[PDB]
Subunit: 236 residues, 6 copies
């Protein structure tokens, strides 16, 4: 057991899918995993282990923000044998050609957090996904007939930014989606020698809004959960 996870080695699979919302982890285990057992409830951060097409898989919330997800991904890597983290989340778009319900894969993650500068002697650490995990996700999306955009996310510390001028900057430099975790998870994965990937669905357009239905949005969220099939591709 670690200070934020009341579990033991073996309780997690060597791959963990992580949404921000602990209730969304419950949704995923119940919708997609067979024989799911709950393996953590400390601080309400529900985590589960079951099987997908016979493959052992865990899913667990990571909370909002780089500091929260850094705790959980660290402890999973160093104390529960986890090799792969797949964040499965929502993001806001700044580019006009990125539409509601697009699937975005973060090959890199920009940030206004200081955590990677602290790690990297105040220089620029390029916070990146594991390439093979990216490729597995692109291929799994193709097999399902979904086109995924691959590029940069931006991991914000302030959901409610006082700036607002920073969204123009993100647009100018081609940021595909704004969320709050990827850069921290990629930093954790480099620091402790594991592999990580962030996939997001566009849940709003920070400029404008666009228009869809609940059924359509929930369909795309389930499409993202690509993540499970990418694991199977990785297993080779």
């Amino acid at each position: 057991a670690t200070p934020h996870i009341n579990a033991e080695m073996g309780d997690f699979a060597d791959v963990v899918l992580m949404p921000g919302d602990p209730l969304r982890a419950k949704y995923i285990a119940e919708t997609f995993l067979e024989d799911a057992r709950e393996v953590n409830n400390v601080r309400g951060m529900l985590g589960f282990t079951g099987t997908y097409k016979g493959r052992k898989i865990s899913v667990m919330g990571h909370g909002m923000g780089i500091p929260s997800c850094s705790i959980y991904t660290k402890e999973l890597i160093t104390d529960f044998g986890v090799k792969k983290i797949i964040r499965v989340g929502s993001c806001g778009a700044v580019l006009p050609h990125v539409k509601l319900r697009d699937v975005v894969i973060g090959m890199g993650a920009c940030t206004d957090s200081k955590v990677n500068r602290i790690r990297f002697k105040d220089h620029d650490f390029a916070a990146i996904a594991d390439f093979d995990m990216v490729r597995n996700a692109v291929d799994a999306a193709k097999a399902l007939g979904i086109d995924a955009r691959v590029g940069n996310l931006f991991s914000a510390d302030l959901f409610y930014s006082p700036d607002g001028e920073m969204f123009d900057v993100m647009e100018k430099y081609g940021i595909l989606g704004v969320e709050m975790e990827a850069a921290g998870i990629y930093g954790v994965a480099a620091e402790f020698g594991a592999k990580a990937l962030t996939i997001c669905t566009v849940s709003n357009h920070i400029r404008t809004h666009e228009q869809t239905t609940a059924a359509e949005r929930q369909t795309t969220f389930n499409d993202m959960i690509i993540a499970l099939e990418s694991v199977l591709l990785g297993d080779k």
Copy 2:
């Protein structure tokens, strides 16, 4: 409703005690409040409203880290008429003369986050509590016979910090507790125009490596809660 709270104006008291652990908010409402009703469960961040000695009072988790609690404290302040936030958390100690379950009152909060530099044009913003709230908490602690140190906390972004040497610097400058929120809450309170205070219980020593359990963290920090609730009463006078 706000993007992270499914409630309406009036569901929250004008004062909200906030631990990081939503299960601890649930424990506070069951143990200390009367007629406690649940007013939020979005993302599992349980929030409750009830009364303490007749005073309407809410309690709601804020999650771990400056970005998490920044979301919740903002929405409480801008859409639910919340005037005072009292964070009631845990912290790790670096000073030798600070032992487990000691109560610390962060008049100020150091940080290695960039959020206040982003608000303050890259200068030093002294993240501070409301003075009257600090004094209320000190007086309530004296009336309860509970010791409490008043000083600087350090709000860390990395619970698992790769810079162990920074603990020596925290120690040198008298930091009473390492937690993960205060400096961001004080920044929100200033940005959005309310008042805040962080009280913490020392739950582990970073040097001695003695620590309290996860079950103890959510259900044994009762002195802190009493200080927090009684300090509201003094503030209402």
Copy 3:
């Protein structure tokens, strides 16, 4: 003797009021102390020791700016047994509801100096006063019938700042007064192990451009001095 003070251990009281203007220290000693003797004139930085209602008390200028007052507060703390520094200065106001001769108590001090980043590994050090000293000053002000706001000061390196827009940011974040020392004094107190507090009199408004004379700045700020001296008396209890 230290490199900037020609005196010996015992010449200073354990509490030193310090304005920036050495002529103001001279005025304080003549007007408020009894049996005042001069204990330093190096570089014209006049310092005096006497008694206030029987309590040994010193007063000495610290010069303008964080680097100037850092020298003097350091030497007082490390070679003259000084335990408490009470800065008694002037400040410029940015908030509309803050008028000339208002008294401000800096529980914290923002700054655009780099000195605390250099002490604190480039992180945010919340430069704060001693809590008991702040409360002493608040209580002494109430007993004297003098209003006083408690909050953040901003310690500027550039009196003539080329960034006028930073005043808007100070205003947004509730900065009660722009002066040039508090954040450095609070940093010295923490580094070298003593306690400090800055009290300031609003001597000009940065927006309205109303200002007090240079002669008024050195001889009309009497309410502040009374608060400072009486707060020491409360602290001795």
Copy 4:
């Protein structure tokens, strides 16, 4: 023409290979392209346009260092309709398991340069390659019987860095190769909306050394150019 390229729109293919050493451009054009024509000579930075298996390709050196290649890549993109840039060159390795003449593909590039912080309001821009170009290079290498590593480069401003400890940090965080351009090319690509990739062969080990021979550095260069060119044809799909 532009300040550093004396040519007209249309003289360059939409894909440009860029070695560092400008003398290698003429080599590539004569060894791997058909029907090559000279399209630039300003300050000895020779450029050529030709075909590889019918596909229009240009090649031109970029100089050493982020400021140099930032100039040439910008002008190609904004004034010559270039859509893809492939930098081909050498790097030094810090990882014990990365060996001399290994092929490294920079999906990302760390840097100690300030150029991206100037672009990105002093936040962290992740300087990344175009994903399809990365994958094209991996597959083209595979088809040539070459396993290629994919991960982070580090683009150093100072070949002779005074901070020997940074190489240990690079190794801790998995940096595959040290060179001097990738992060700057990636930033320009993002700034003006084109696509870029850096491929490097390991020419030396910062740990120990025992560098490579002459015919080995000839075989290995040819493999890298072959990989880059076949990757373009894969990108055409």
Copy 5:
């Protein structure tokens, strides 16, 4: 009158010599200026105007540190018509070949202050003297048979540094003297369009100490006060 100088246009010469110590300004007026009148005493920061070989010259303290001297040099430039500031001060040496009582001329001034980054959009502003003033000082020292070193000073914010490792850095990069004002004065002079020069005598060796006599040290201080003759050379 300005907020820190109780004087009027005309009261100062268009060149001001400035030591840190207001008592040292009094010493200089009394030792070197004819018909000296005191023209400022606000905050005890004594300033004087007299003549040197018939040339009108002022001298005035500037206090310790960049923030203090920035106030006084600013107000002198924008409100009293001053064109040239010559700081005349003491510095500590870090180089082993820089000896006690060497005369050091700051063609540039390094600093750990943030004031020039604030002025210069967070980039590196090279805080420099006016070249002609440097050359006049070198020539005046030569005519007096004194060899002056010209190079970098370092302007510290903390006389009592918590670092201490920074002195090795200054030594490595050839810093001739450590004081507390030059970089701020050069920043003021660029910002408001005036000219400035810092001359220092080495009053200690931050490593080791060396050994001289009071009479010898006071002789070298008077040699520095070079400054007066450099003005006359500047007048052409």
Copy 6:
């Protein structure tokens, strides 16, 4: 030999002239030196050693940008006993009174590069020339009937900067010329204990433009080389 210079100790004079454009080195050697011999050719960066009025001089180009010239100047100083480096090149002007083909001598060099902050523990290093070399150049120019301005250069990392407002700041603080190397050469000179100077002719005005012709840029280049070479003889005293 060094990684970028295939030569031996003694092949270079103790004084090296460095243009940016490497093709200018052969020009200088053939036009102003006697008995010139080729001493380097690695990646087309030709170097030559000869005499000017009996004085041994070398010339070799430095590439564009701080990282490029930092490599070559370092290796010359640490491995070829070089004592003085004179960079000769062009710059852009922001000041209305600085005119095309004016000669500018960089007593100091501002920069938006991070290299000196990496050297100087993130403080402000003033990147400065050697004073005697400055004065030698002024006097040599005077003797040729050329008035030369002396002050600050700005060494830009990005020729194509995304912050158009920085040119206004440069103009406010008196920058005489914008180029891309001076501050980096000055930092290397200080790091390894040698002497350096950058001389520039104004080739364009950032304000407006209306650049210079061909025979004008020929006359002006020759004047700059003449100034640099006569300045060396003045330095020999």
